[PDB]
Design a protein that fits this description.
- The structure is cut from a larger assembly and holds chains A (about 120 residues), B (about 210 residues), C (about 55 residues), D (about 120 residues) and E (about 110 residues).
- By secondary structure, chain B is mainly beta.
- Chain B contains two helices and twelve strands; from the N terminus they run ββββαββββαββββ.
- Chain E has one domain.
- Chain E is about 10% helix and about 40% strand.
- In chain E, strands 4-3-2-1-5 form a five-stranded antiparallel β-sheet, with no helix packed on it.
- Classes of the chains: A mainly beta (about 120), B mainly beta (about 210), C little secondary structure (about 55), D alpha+beta (about 120), E mainly beta (about 110).
- Bound molecules: N-formylmethionine, potassium ion (2 copies) and magnesium ion (248 copies).
- The site of one magnesium ion (MG) has 2 residues of chain C, from loops.
- Chain B binds four RNA strands through strand 1, strand 2, strand 3, helix 1 and strand 5.
- Chain E: This protein is located at the 30S-50S ribosomal subunit interface and may play a role in the structure and function of the aminoacyl-tRNA binding site.
Chain lengths: ~120, ~210, ~55, ~120, ~110
RNA sequence: CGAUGUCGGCUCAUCACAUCCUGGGGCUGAAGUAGGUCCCAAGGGUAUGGCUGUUCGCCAUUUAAAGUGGUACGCGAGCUGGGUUUAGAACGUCGUGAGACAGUUCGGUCCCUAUCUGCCGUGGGCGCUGGAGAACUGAGGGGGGCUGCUCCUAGUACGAGAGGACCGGAGUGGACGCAUCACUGGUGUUCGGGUUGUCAUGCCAAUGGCACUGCCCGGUAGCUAAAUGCGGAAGAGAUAAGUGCUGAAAGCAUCUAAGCACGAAACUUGCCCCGAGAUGAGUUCUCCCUGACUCCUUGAGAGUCCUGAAGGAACGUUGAAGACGACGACGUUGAUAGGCCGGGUGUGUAAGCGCAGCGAUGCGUUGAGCUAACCGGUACUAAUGAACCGUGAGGCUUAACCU
RNA sequence: AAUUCCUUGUCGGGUAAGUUCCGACCUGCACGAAUGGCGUAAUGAUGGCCAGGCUGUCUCCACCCGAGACUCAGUGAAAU
RNA sequence: ACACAGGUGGUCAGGUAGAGAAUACCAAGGCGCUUGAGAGAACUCGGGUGAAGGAACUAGGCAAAAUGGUGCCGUAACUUC
RNA sequence: AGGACCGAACCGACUAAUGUCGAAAAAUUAGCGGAUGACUUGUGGCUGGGGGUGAAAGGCCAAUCAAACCGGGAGAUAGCU
């Protein structure tokens, strides 16, 4: 359950350490993002050697949330940190070469199959 | 046509595919036809049913007479349904839950749970005003209710505080899941109105 | 707040129509002693349904 | 909106409400008959009648529980020694409500509550 | 009610092993990769146990690849295949939500061995 | 002017159409995609932030779109008081000065218990023509009406190509509404436990009081969203702008003058809710009452005795019903409350013993003890025999058809 | 700039975006030296701006606990 | 003006905890504040808790949340030292 | 040592909400500033109306202040209502 101003740790190794959600894309008045949704990000904290510098506006996919993901059985999968993977605005596709930590099944939808292959779990 | 049925809580049906579907358990006793209204007498073709039972003293003589003309036992209440031309029913006929075996979706009707007197926030989803920043005695109030001199009046159907619930409401096209004849049940996917032990009216979907 | 111009005897009366309080008209009689009392209440002497159950 | 809820608030806070029943149960056990307000009487049943069942099995833990509630060893002595064995055969329903009109100073509906014996 | 209680009791699997909170449990889960049907393991500490018959459930906490993952399982789901117990913790609480704040050495729990 | 509180915000809106999107169309400097313009169309929908008192505005990022206006530049007996407009103070400036400045700067009391109208709810009264209990019809209101992508059609038509569809179908979203508590949670001072200070129960041990529930930890039932089901429609009729057909006036032409068709989220229906106070008070179905006598202006009459029905109200026990009324259940031929019993659920191994230790403490009995609102039972209490209201065959004309 | 009208002056910083803020420039409408000029540590219920922490401020409100409101009895005003 | 949540000088100074005349619980002693009784709607007042988020609120973090003790370690620019 | 520090009494009155026919013609509640000093307070004195007093606000001088209150000139005068 990510929204404007929510700060996210970064799952991939793009360069960003922390980022901030500046918009939830895909509809008017749209409250929240989660699960495997696209969001607009500004980078609030980056590392020195990384591919993306601080204060860069680009897109991202939420891969983990504290509120979690409901499977159809009624069961839920929560996490200990909201987390995302950065994407290239217009081109899409992840910037980083590797992905840290697990990512849910509900991320599986063609365009993010690169994000699942690199991921160590689920 | 339709059947009258008590609401009996909720459960979930796990399918082996790997899905739990949340079901409302509606127990549907033998709905016995007390009277058949037709275009000769009434001006519309319809049937009047009953269900459950009542106590010998608690039923009045006007009802007890009415029930004695059909030959059926006095059921707890009376409901009526219209007839869809082709189908035609006889008096003293006990309609079972096997009517919903062939169908897929149903419009469950019921009297909703009485929330009592409700404020504009709860009733109409009015937005609470600022909880602080100077606000004086007016956090959950409705705010303005009209313009100024031009109307010089509140318009009709203005959303205000007042009675919420205890009103007839219809959830449309709920999917039927299991139709147990042995125990006299009807399992529908999702939540339907009223509380556990309330009277529902189940009837086939109108938007097929 | 505050009336624009005073109401009448009439209105005031109309309002008071529903203020008229109802009598009991339903006094019981105790089986043994034959004393009048409220239904489901004891008597002044201390009876309820033909049996003393109080000093 | 209080659907399916229990307990009367009786225009008090919890800690008070819990005390006034702790006293009023103690008063009912001692005198065996009480004049109170019809609601207070109806809500006293829920406090007292368990202390009577608690008192059927005389031991230690039950005496200590019956002392944790009530907080008076006299009442705990009248329970267990008398009211425990006196209601041995009877299953629940140890107390009786009888309405006794209206209070003078405030028109409150009064009621006598007493134990079902007083022989 | 009896009507519901009859519908629940037929659906409940009658072979769930007994596990307490603070037990290291390895839940096996049916997963589907479109056409496939795999069994995924999920080893972790049992943190909370809800008992409501058919509606019973339990939370398992697992400190995987850096960050922690909590997974609530619906006990009588067919998706849960098996619930094997590995360790039994000497804990004296029902819900172990205090473990969320802790990590590593503080997060570890004494074994029962009674 | 014996006072009509004036910017902006918040809350709540409502109408207009000169339409922002959505829908329907004509021409194009319209190949397709994407437009340009004009016509019809008001059903629904129509951002969140940064800066600033701002409305605007400029940005950032969205969105199908981020409409223009009216409503005392809607809305202070609804909120705010940042702005402007009291008293303090200072800067620049003008004045010899008091002071002054649509110049700036810091600080600076926003009262009202609702009589009427109105509105949202909820009742009493009588009426509807003998009374009573049901069930309805539905005149007439009222809600609802939003869209996105992705796939399929199809890399199809259209194009050297790059691009790339109409009509058609499908899935899954956003926003909004309705229901609901099965799941996920929140709450849960009425359930368990840990614990600090302290007082008390003669003392130990064990408890209770107070300290924001003392502070915490979990959590039942309810209530609830972030939770989960559902909704918007298809269809039908009459149509706008438009498209036509046949076709005179005007040997032709011509959508129009006769006639005949199509044609939109608008209109009337279809969906949902209310609704016979619809005084035009409507239908059915049932139920109940089949007595004597007096007086008069021989009246739709004042009466006397005698009867009291169906039903109702009251009273009680009460409820997922409720401010009070109301509404639903129930009153012994009884599960309506409470108790009790069994189960559950929660808490997490009570007390007392007995071991182990030098003591805190730890084992054992023991998943124990204690468990609100829960589930299934149980007449243990408490729901009374009764009294009270309500009657005694139901007006007058006419017309159909009964023996 | 407590002083600047034009004006949200330009440029730089901070921000995804900064009419405020900080630094700089000087075209000072209309600073300027005891009606003091410029500096500056410390101090301030001082004005402006930023950050961490934290939060029902808000997204977006939910539930609970008490005091009223509501019913019953007693007393019993007020503005107009 | 009221049996009015105001104002009014001095003196006395028990216990456990505490630096303490703070605060908590208490002793001596004193009182329960002169309308009650029900119910447990909206709404208001004073509180408690709150999923994910965390100033997005607003003129302004106003208001709430926070931080809070003792010992020891450790502590920047600048300074009138 | 200190118009030093933190903090109760005591003196104050920065913020907020409540209250605004109030509990109260200025208070309550929760925070807030000073708290060995240019401090605070009791008791009694002195200064008087164009006068006093004023770490200056036109503040204060008995709930009254850009000239107190009471009586008098006095039925001031009012081209105004
Ligand atoms: C005492 S200054 C009053 C200023 C005035 N207020 C209302 O009208 C303006 O106009
Ligand atoms: K033990
Ligand atoms: K004179
Ligand atoms: Mg930047
Ligand atoms: Mg007929
Ligand atoms: Mg019945
Ligand atoms: Mg209710
Ligand atoms: Mg409410
Ligand atoms: Mg609203
Ligand atoms: Mg708000
Ligand atoms: Mg204010
Ligand atoms: Mg106000
Ligand atoms: Mg105020
Ligand atoms: Mg409020
Ligand atoms: Mg008018
Ligand atoms: Mg007037
Ligand atoms: Mg009269
Ligand atoms: Mg009245
Ligand atoms: Mg009797
Ligand atoms: Mg109940
Ligand atoms: Mg209650
Ligand atoms: Mg009281
Ligand atoms: Mg009271
Ligand atoms: Mg009280
Ligand atoms: Mg307490
Ligand atoms: Mg009980
Ligand atoms: Mg027993
Ligand atoms: Mg005038
Ligand atoms: Mg006037
Ligand atoms: Mg006015
Ligand atoms: Mg305005
Ligand atoms: Mg605003
Ligand atoms: Mg607004
Ligand atoms: Mg509207
Ligand atoms: Mg309009
Ligand atoms: Mg135009
Ligand atoms: Mg247009
Ligand atoms: Mg367009
Ligand atoms: Mg479309
Ligand atoms: Mg179109
Ligand atoms: Mg179309
Ligand atoms: Mg078009
Ligand atoms: Mg074209
Ligand atoms: Mg045209
Ligand atoms: Mg038009
Ligand atoms: Mg409209
Ligand atoms: Mg219209
Ligand atoms: Mg329409
Ligand atoms: Mg509308
Ligand atoms: Mg708009
Ligand atoms: Mg906007
Ligand atoms: Mg822009
Ligand atoms: Mg406009
Ligand atoms: Mg005006
Ligand atoms: Mg205008
Ligand atoms: Mg205005
Ligand atoms: Mg305008
Ligand atoms: Mg106001
Ligand atoms: Mg206004
Ligand atoms: Mg107004
Ligand atoms: Mg107001
Ligand atoms: Mg102000
Ligand atoms: Mg202000
Ligand atoms: Mg101001
Ligand atoms: Mg100002
Ligand atoms: Mg001034
Ligand atoms: Mg001016
Ligand atoms: Mg100006
Ligand atoms: Mg300013
Ligand atoms: Mg100030
Ligand atoms: Mg104020
Ligand atoms: Mg009124
Ligand atoms: Mg009115
Ligand atoms: Mg109205
Ligand atoms: Mg009439
Ligand atoms: Mg009628
Ligand atoms: Mg008629
Ligand atoms: Mg109609
Ligand atoms: Mg009408
Ligand atoms: Mg409408
Ligand atoms: Mg669509
Ligand atoms: Mg293809
Ligand atoms: Mg293609
Ligand atoms: Mg189409
Ligand atoms: Mg709407
Ligand atoms: Mg919803
Ligand atoms: Mg339930
Ligand atoms: Mg439940
Ligand atoms: Mg639960
Ligand atoms: Mg308790
Ligand atoms: Mg407890
Ligand atoms: Mg102690
Ligand atoms: Mg002692
Ligand atoms: Mg001792
Ligand atoms: Mg002890
Ligand atoms: Mg112990
Ligand atoms: Mg104890
Ligand atoms: Mg005490
Ligand atoms: Mg005390
Ligand atoms: Mg607190
Ligand atoms: Mg606290
Ligand atoms: Mg804690
Ligand atoms: Mg909890
Ligand atoms: Mg929980
Ligand atoms: Mg449809
Ligand atoms: Mg259509
Ligand atoms: Mg057709
Ligand atoms: Mg047509
Ligand atoms: Mg036609
Ligand atoms: Mg044309
Ligand atoms: Mg022709
Ligand atoms: Mg010609
Ligand atoms: Mg011619
Ligand atoms: Mg032609
Ligand atoms: Mg043509
Ligand atoms: Mg549509
Ligand atoms: Mg109806
Ligand atoms: Mg008439
Ligand atoms: Mg009729
Ligand atoms: Mg008739
Ligand atoms: Mg008839
Ligand atoms: Mg006469
Ligand atoms: Mg009789
Ligand atoms: Mg009689
Ligand atoms: Mg009879
Ligand atoms: Mg009731
Ligand atoms: Mg009730
Ligand atoms: Mg009624
Ligand atoms: Mg009625
Ligand atoms: Mg009634
Ligand atoms: Mg009834
Ligand atoms: Mg009944
Ligand atoms: Mg009865
Ligand atoms: Mg009996
Ligand atoms: Mg039985
Ligand atoms: Mg019961
Ligand atoms: Mg019970
Ligand atoms: Mg029990
Ligand atoms: Mg047992
Ligand atoms: Mg058991
Ligand atoms: Mg039990
Ligand atoms: Mg258990
Ligand atoms: Mg043990
Ligand atoms: Mg214990
Ligand atoms: Mg030993
Ligand atoms: Mg064991
Ligand atoms: Mg064992
Ligand atoms: Mg066991
Ligand atoms: Mg056992
Ligand atoms: Mg037990
Ligand atoms: Mg128990
Ligand atoms: Mg039961
Ligand atoms: Mg028996
Ligand atoms: Mg029996
Ligand atoms: Mg017996
Ligand atoms: Mg009876
Ligand atoms: Mg006759
Ligand atoms: Mg006759
Ligand atoms: Mg007849
Ligand atoms: Mg006749
Ligand atoms: Mg400037
Ligand atoms: Mg300027
Ligand atoms: Mg710049
Ligand atoms: Mg920059
Ligand atoms: Mg900012
Ligand atoms: Mg700049
Ligand atoms: Mg500013
Ligand atoms: Mg700002
Ligand atoms: Mg500067
Ligand atoms: Mg110069
Ligand atoms: Mg100069
Ligand atoms: Mg000059
Ligand atoms: Mg100067
Ligand atoms: Mg100069
Ligand atoms: Mg000078
Ligand atoms: Mg000079
Ligand atoms: Mg100076
Ligand atoms: Mg300077
Ligand atoms: Mg300087
Ligand atoms: Mg400095
Ligand atoms: Mg100072
Ligand atoms: Mg200061
Ligand atoms: Mg400051
Ligand atoms: Mg600031
Ligand atoms: Mg901050
Ligand atoms: Mg809400
Ligand atoms: Mg409450
Ligand atoms: Mg009264
Ligand atoms: Mg008067
Ligand atoms: Mg008093
Ligand atoms: Mg006093
Ligand atoms: Mg005081
Ligand atoms: Mg200490
Ligand atoms: Mg103290
Ligand atoms: Mg008092
Ligand atoms: Mg209430
Ligand atoms: Mg309350
Ligand atoms: Mg509060
Ligand atoms: Mg509150
Ligand atoms: Mg607390
Ligand atoms: Mg809190
Ligand atoms: Mg929160
Ligand atoms: Mg919690
Ligand atoms: Mg949290
Ligand atoms: Mg944070
Ligand atoms: Mg902001
Ligand atoms: Mg804003
Ligand atoms: Mg600002
Ligand atoms: Mg500011
Ligand atoms: Mg802050
Ligand atoms: Mg603050
Ligand atoms: Mg708060
Ligand atoms: Mg907190
Ligand atoms: Mg605080
Ligand atoms: Mg905190
Ligand atoms: Mg804390
Ligand atoms: Mg702390
Ligand atoms: Mg420290
Ligand atoms: Mg530094
Ligand atoms: Mg400096
Ligand atoms: Mg000194
Ligand atoms: Mg000092
Ligand atoms: Mg210091
Ligand atoms: Mg301080
Ligand atoms: Mg003093
Ligand atoms: Mg003050
Ligand atoms: Mg003061
Ligand atoms: Mg402040
Ligand atoms: Mg407050
Ligand atoms: Mg007031
Ligand atoms: Mg008041
Ligand atoms: Mg204070
Ligand atoms: Mg503070
Ligand atoms: Mg302080
Ligand atoms: Mg200081
Ligand atoms: Mg003084
Ligand atoms: Mg003196
Ligand atoms: Mg003197
Ligand atoms: Mg003078
Ligand atoms: Mg003089
Ligand atoms: Mg003189
Ligand atoms: Mg002089
Ligand atoms: Mg002075
Ligand atoms: Mg001045
Ligand atoms: Mg004065
Ligand atoms: Mg003055
Ligand atoms: Mg003068
Ligand atoms: Mg003078
Ligand atoms: Mg004087
Ligand atoms: Mg004279
Ligand atoms: Mg005169």
């Amino acid at each position: 359950m990510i929204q404007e101003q929510t700060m996210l740790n970064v799952a991939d190794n793009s360069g960003a350490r922390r980022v901030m959600c500046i918009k939830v894309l895909g509809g008017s008045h749209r409250r929240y993002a989660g699960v495997g949704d696209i969001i607009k990000i500004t980078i609030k904290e980056a590392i020195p050697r990384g591919k993306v510098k601080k204060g860069d506006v680009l897109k991202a996919v939420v891969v983990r949330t504290k509120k979690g993901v409901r499977r159809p059985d009624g069961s839920v999968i929560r996490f200990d940190g909201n987390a995302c993977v950065l994407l290239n605005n217009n081109s899409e596709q992840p910037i980083g070469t590797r992905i840290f930590g697990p990512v849910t099944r509900e991320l599986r939808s063609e365009k993010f199959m690169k994000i699942i292959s690199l991921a160590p779990e689920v | 046509i339709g059947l009258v049925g008590k609401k009996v809580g909720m459960t979930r049906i796990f399918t082996e595919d790997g899905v739990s579907i949340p079901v409302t358990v509606i127990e549907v006793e033998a709905n016995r036809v007390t009277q058949v209204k037709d275009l000769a007498n009434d001006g519309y073709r319809a049937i009047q049913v009953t269900t459950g039972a009542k106590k010998a003293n608690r039923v009045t003589k006007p009802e007890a007479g009415h029930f004695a003309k059909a030959g059926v036992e006095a059921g707890r209440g009376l409901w009526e349904f219209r007839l869809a031309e082709g189908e035609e029913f006889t008096v003293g006929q006990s309609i079972s839950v096997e009517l919903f075996a062939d169908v897929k979706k149903v419009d469950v009707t019921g009297t909703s749970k009485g929330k009592g007197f409700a404020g504009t926030v709860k009733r109409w989803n009015f937005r609470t005003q600022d909880a602080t920043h100077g606000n004086s005695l007016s956090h959950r109030v409705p705010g303005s209710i009209g313009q100024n001199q031009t109307p010089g009046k509140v318009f009709k159907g203005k959303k205000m505080a007042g009675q919420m619930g205890n009103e007839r409401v219809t959830v449309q096209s709920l999917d039927v899941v299991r139709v147990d004849a042995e125990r006299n049940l009807l399992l529908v996917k999702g939540a339907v109105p009223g509380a556990t032990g309330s009277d529902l009216i189940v009837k086939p979907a109108v938007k097929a | 707040a505050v009336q624009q111009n005073k109401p009448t005897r009439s209105k005031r009366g109309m309002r008071r129509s529903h203020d008229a309080l109802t009598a009991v008209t339903s006094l019981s009689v105790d089986k043994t002693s034959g004393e009048k009392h409220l239904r489901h209440h004891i008597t002044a002497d201390g009876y309820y349904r033909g049996r003393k159950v109080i000093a | 909106m209080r659907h399916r809820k229990s307990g009367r608030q009786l225009n008090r806070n919890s800690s008070h409400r819990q005390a006034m029943f702790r006293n009023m149960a103690g008063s009912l056990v001692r005198h065996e008959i009480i004049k109170t307000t019809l609601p207070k009487a109806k809500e006293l049943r829920r406090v007292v009648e368990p202390l009577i069942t608690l008192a059927k099995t005389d031991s230690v833990a039950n005496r200590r529980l019956a002392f944790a509630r009530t907080r008076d060893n006299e009442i705990v002595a009248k329970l267990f020694n008398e009211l425990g064995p006196r209601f041995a055969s009877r299953a629940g329903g140890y107390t009786r409500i009888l309405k006794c009109g209206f209070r003078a100073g405030d028109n409150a509906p009064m009621a006598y509550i007493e134990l079902v014996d007083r022989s | 009610s009896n009507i519901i209680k009859q519908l629940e009791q037929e659906q409940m699997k009658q072979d769930v092993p007994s596990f307490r909170p603070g037990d290291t449990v390895e839940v096996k889960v049916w997963v589907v990769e479109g056409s496939k049907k795999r069994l995924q393991a999920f080893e972790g500490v049992v943190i909370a146990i809800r008992n409501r018959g058919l509606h019973s459930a339990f939370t398992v906490r697992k400190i995987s690849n850096g960050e922690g993952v909590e997974r609530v399982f619906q006990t009588h789901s067919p998706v849960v295949d098996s619930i094997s117990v590995k360790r039994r913790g000497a804990v004296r609480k029902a819900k172990l939500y205090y473990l969320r704040e802790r990590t590593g050495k503080a997060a570890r729990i004494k074994e029962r061995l009674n």
